[PDB]
Amino acid sequence: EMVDNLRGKSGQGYYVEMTVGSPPQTLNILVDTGSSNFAVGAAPHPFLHRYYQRQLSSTYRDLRKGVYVPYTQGKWEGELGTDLVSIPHGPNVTVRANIAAITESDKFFINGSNWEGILGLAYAEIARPDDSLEPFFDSLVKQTHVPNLFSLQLCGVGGSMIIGGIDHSLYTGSLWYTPIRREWYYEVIIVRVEINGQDLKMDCKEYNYDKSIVDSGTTNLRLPKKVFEAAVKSIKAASSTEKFPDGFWLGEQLVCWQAGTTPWNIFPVISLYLMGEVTNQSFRITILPQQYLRPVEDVATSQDDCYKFAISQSSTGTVMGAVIMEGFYVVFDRARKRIGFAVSACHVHDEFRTAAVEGPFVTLEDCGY
Ligand SMILES: COc1cccc(-c2cccc([C@H](NC(=N)N)c3ccncc3)c2)c1
């Protein structure tokens, strides 16, 4: 019943249907592992099909507290309250949770994304205005007998969010676990990066400057400047039979090929080696160009297949975004403070290569900041 409960894409976000208030008001909500507030549009907007009308809910309680969230690309603001919340294609429960009613925003809502709010699945440490605001998943666990775990199968129906468990039909092979370094974002540690089997040969701390996170609310694989520049150099060298505009590598412009002729074989695989559950042991997640080249669907360019390079520079650490998660079944095992990865039953691949999750690997220094 929870299988296939997500819709959406890496570019615009994956979403789950939710209900807020009594009588319930149906809303589409972005599944965001990179934030911790349950924040919903609560006032009309040109990009919103519907919104939260607190006046219609008898169960709404005003917390008499404002919330202002300016971020690098834009802002959201509104006010805090609590109300009854349910996930129609999730667990069979109703919980009372904190809700940030978004009354004003700048570059937050996306035209045609089909979502009206965000379900921030990360920890209280990063909740706004401060850490006393209990995130949704914490309320769900405290109030019910739902196990403290959730899993995400993002399929480039658009995917599945399994609350309280792991669904075996969603993956193949083994689940490999990386520890959650600190409970704020879903922070992890990358120990090694290879591009077409070639080690980038950087000190492993470089990969996690200043943190590395698993974020369903970011499109791209985002890398620290030093790592990004080496990655681009290695991908350029492997795909040298074709020369693309510099705007392509900057994730600014599209690369197009006649429909059905994308030369997948000229692009390398990228392996991210994640820290294992035991000392100096690791496992690798392998990404194909089918993951790092994000198609941009547009009827006007439809004689071709056009893509954006979905690897970009970060000044805030590594972000394993939606394009990376698309290759795998990702278990957020909060109860055991660990993140599991397994090959997704829905990942996009070809007759030559498959995305992989494999290990163990042995190295004989700490890779964290
Ligand atoms: C791949 O999914 C996507 C795609 C497109 C947009 C968004 C998205 C839209 C708005 C905000 C966020 C954004 N979430 C991030 N995790 N970066 C956020 C920022 C501040 N407060 C809460 C959440 C993310 C998420």
Boundary (domain end) residue, out of 115, 146, 177:
146
Domain final residue pick, 116, 146, 176: 146
With respect to residue 3, please indicate whether it lies within any of the assigned structural domains: no
Q: Which two tokens stand for residue 195?
A: 């591009």
Experimental technique behind these coordinates: X-ray
Alpha-carbon dihedral angle through residues 290, 180, 358, 287, given to the nearest 10 degrees: 10
Shared domain check, 165 and 74: no
Cβ-based neighbour number of residue 137 at 10 Å: 23
**Residues 79 and 216 reside in one and the same domain:** no
Domain boundary among 146, 168, 183: 146
Q: Is residue 4 part of a domain?
A: no
- Ligand 1 center to residue 359 CA distance, Å? 32
Q: Answer whether residue 118 is part of any domain.
A: yes
Q: Does 238 lie in the same domain as 109?
A: no
Coil/strand/helix, residue 368:
coil
Through-space distance between the first and last CA atoms of the chain, rounded to whole angstroms: 41
Domain count of the fold of the chain: 2
**Token reading at 179:** 């520890």
Q: Ligand 1: distance of its center to the CA of 315 in Å?
A: 17
Catalytic positions, written as ranges:
32, 215
Q: Which of 29, 30, 114 for a ligand 1 pocket mutation test, highest count of atoms within 8 Å of Cβ?
A: 30
Report which of 296, 322, 292 is spatially closest to residue 310, judged by C-alpha positions: 292
Length of the chain: 369
From the number of C-beta atoms within 10 Å of its C-beta (0-12, 13-18, 19+), residue 93 rates as middle
Give the 3-state secondary structure of residue 231.
Answer: helix
Resolution in angstrom units: 1.9
DSSP state of 308: E
State how far the Cα of 181 lies from the Cα of 212, in Å rounded to an integer.
9
Q: Provide the greatest CA pair distance for the chain.
A: 64
Is the domain of 96 the same as that of 202? no
**Adjacent-strand bridge partners of 74:** none
Minimum-distance ligand 1 atom for the alpha carbon of 321 = 1
Cα(225)–Cα(313) distance, integer angstroms? 5
Name 144's Cβ contacts closer than 8 Å, sequence gap at least 6.
91, 93, 95
Residues 110 and 249 in one domain: no
Are the beta carbons of 86 and 19 closer than 8 angstroms? yes
**Residues 166 and 271 reside in one and the same domain:** yes
Q: Which residues line ligand 1 (CB under 6 A)?
A: 10, 12-13, 30, 32, 34-35, 69, 71, 108, 110, 118, 215, 217-219, 322
Q: Which sign, positive or negative, has the C-alpha torsion 58, 59, 64, 65?
A: negative
Structure tokens at 141: 């666990």
Å from CA of 12 to ligand 1 middle: 9
Nearest partner of 160 among 15, 4, 332, 331, judged by Cα: 4
Q: Token pair for residue 40?
A: 């919903």
List own/partner pairs for 134-137 with CB under 8 A and 24 or more apart: 134/97, 134/98, 135/36, 135/37, 135/38, 135/98, 136/38, 136/85, 136/95, 136/97, 136/98, 137/334
State whether 155 and 263 are in the same domain.
yes
Closest residue to atom 15 of ligand 1, CA basis:
217
Same domain as 265, residue 164: yes
Tell me the residue range of the domain where 83 lies.
14-146
